[PDB]
Ligand binder design. Structure first.
Ligand code: MET
Length: 493
């Protein structure tokens, strides 16, 4: 069984969880579940990034230690994962001892390759981004203060600092981008990165000089928060122990991240991995941002699956998008409550009332029967091709187009009228509808897991007949008992 490793960015837990974090986790969860159902051996990581100057300063404001703050706020992030029904296999915190040892190992690996030196710089520095900047990347605003590109103040500094020889990787990075056209996506991101690297790379500062991982052999220094943070992805697999059973999951198939942190993952990270003699992830994919506050309240007001569906359907993955009360209510009423849920309820109640709650024996399929059935099978192939490109909206779009067409099929067959005229044919039509519903049910599991389970329970589908392979392999059999149908998607109160 082919191995598939997917990760989310690890959030700074310096406050409460926000919807950005929830969005990223839901989308990564969907992708992970999709691949499980598609027959892969999946490892799915998320976690928290607990070092950094931004954590230090938040700790000071609250008047506690950064470990204290990290420990307190992290519980909320873990609780968010449980509430969003996240299927992650591990949870990483960069305060753990395994990470400390991982980060010091990858560091040593880069030193062994000759890519790390101690040196002197003189330039603008932002304390909060732990990064130097060139005068060109800065501006003096009306308050008379010079700001760097990432929004924060820069001051002039002359210090010794450890450096990574990022200049030695310009050409190897450009080859990576030619040879692997899907390494950093979507396209708008690819071009930012390719252009940034074509225009020249300066060596990168990777230490400062008391909350972080000490640079091995020189404890007066601590590792820049990004070197540390990126290592999370290989820490979770047992690095540096390459005989750990998890290690075969490396290289990651997909790092899901937000667009504001592309450069770290598509430039720094591969450079570091090359240096440490490790293989590179197959893809980094950057989602956009959401605009209107608290994920827990949203789940409470709308339902988890309603929110999951909305976010993954209404925004093209990669692009920025909007959400509002009215949008979520209307789109989830239309697609879930009405289109899918009411097709299930009407059809399954007709089977309950008119066929003794047994799946009816289908006869010859008509042209219209074969068309809707085939459209369902076709949706699986489209969903697969979509998810390979992180196109969650297209995967869901294809599956729900089958739902829309199934309502038209149902209405147009007029099965109530057939009750009197032709009960054999009524049965065939109810069969088809039930069978289309089984195929949809299987396909939507990754996106709306609990609701999908409830819809398949209603269709009496065994627990071991809900893989994507079962869409073609395991059709409903006439005669099977079905429990009394309750609505799966209540209309919004
Ligand atoms: C190695 S992913 C680190 C992400 C970072 N803590 C952020 O939230 O921006």
């Amino acid at each position: 069984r082919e191995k598939y490793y997917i990760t989310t960015a690890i959030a700074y837990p310096n406050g409460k969880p926000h919807i950005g974090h929830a969005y990223e986790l839901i989308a990564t969860d969907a992708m992970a579940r999709f691949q499980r159902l598609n027959g892969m051996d999946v490892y799915f990581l998320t976690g928290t990034d607990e070092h950094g100057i931004k954590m230090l300063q938040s700790a000071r404001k609250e008047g506690i230690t950064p470990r204290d703050l990290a420990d307190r706020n992290t519980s909320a992030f873990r609780r968010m994962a449980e509430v969003l029904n996240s299927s992650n296999d591990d949870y990483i915190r960069t305060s753990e001892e395994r990470h400390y040892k991982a980060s010091q190992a990858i560091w040593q690996a880069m030193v062994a390759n000759g890519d790390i030196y101690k040196g002197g710089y003189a330039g603008w520095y932002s304390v909060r981004d732990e990064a130097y900047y060139g005068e060109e990347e800065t501006e003096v605003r009306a308050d008379g203060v010079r700001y760097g590109p990432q929004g924060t103040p820069v001051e002039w500094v002359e210090e010794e600092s450890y450096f990574f020889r990022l200049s030695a990787y310009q050409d190897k990075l450009l080859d990576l981008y030619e040879n692997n056209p899907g390494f950093i996506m979507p396209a708008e991101r690819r071009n930012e990165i390719v252009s940034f690297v074509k225009s020249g790379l300066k060596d990168l500062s990777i230490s400062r000089t008391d909350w972080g991982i000490p640079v091995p052999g020189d404890e007066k220094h601590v590792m820049y928060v990004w070197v540390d943070a990126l290592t999370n992805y290989i820490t979770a697999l047992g690095y540096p122990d390459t005989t750990d059973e998890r290690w075969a999951y490396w290289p990651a198939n997909a790092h899901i991240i937000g667009k504001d942190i592309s450069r770290f993952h598509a430039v720094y990270w591969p450079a570091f991995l090359m240096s440490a003699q490790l293989p590179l992830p197959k893809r980094v994919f950057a989602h956009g941002f959401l605009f209107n506050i608290d994920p827990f309240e949203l789940v409470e007001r709308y339902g988890l699956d309603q929110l999951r569906y909305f976010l993954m359907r209404e925004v093209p993955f990669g692009q920025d998008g909007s959400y509002s009360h009215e949008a979520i209510v209307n789109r989830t009423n239309a697609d879930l409550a009405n289109d899918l849920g009411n097709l299930a309820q009407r059809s399954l109640s007709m089977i309950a009332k008119n066929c003794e709650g047994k799946v009816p024996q289908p006869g010859a399929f008509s042209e219209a029967d074969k068309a809707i059935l085939d459209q369902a099978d076709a949706a699986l192939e489209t969903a697969r091709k979509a998810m390979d490109d992180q196109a969650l909206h297209l995967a869901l779009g294809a599956i729900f187009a089958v739902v829309a067409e199934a309502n038209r099929y149902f209405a147009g067959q007029e099965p109530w009228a057939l009750r009197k005229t032709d009960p054999a044919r009524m049965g065939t039509v109810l069969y088809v509808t039930a069978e289309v519903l089984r195929r949809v049910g299987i396909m939507v599991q990754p996106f709306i897991p609990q609701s999908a389970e409830k819809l398949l329970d209603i269709l009496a589908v065994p627990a071991d007949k809900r893989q994507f392979a079962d869409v073609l392999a395991s059709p409903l059999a006439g005669g099977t008992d079905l429990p009394a149908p309750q609505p799966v998607f209540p209309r919004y109160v």
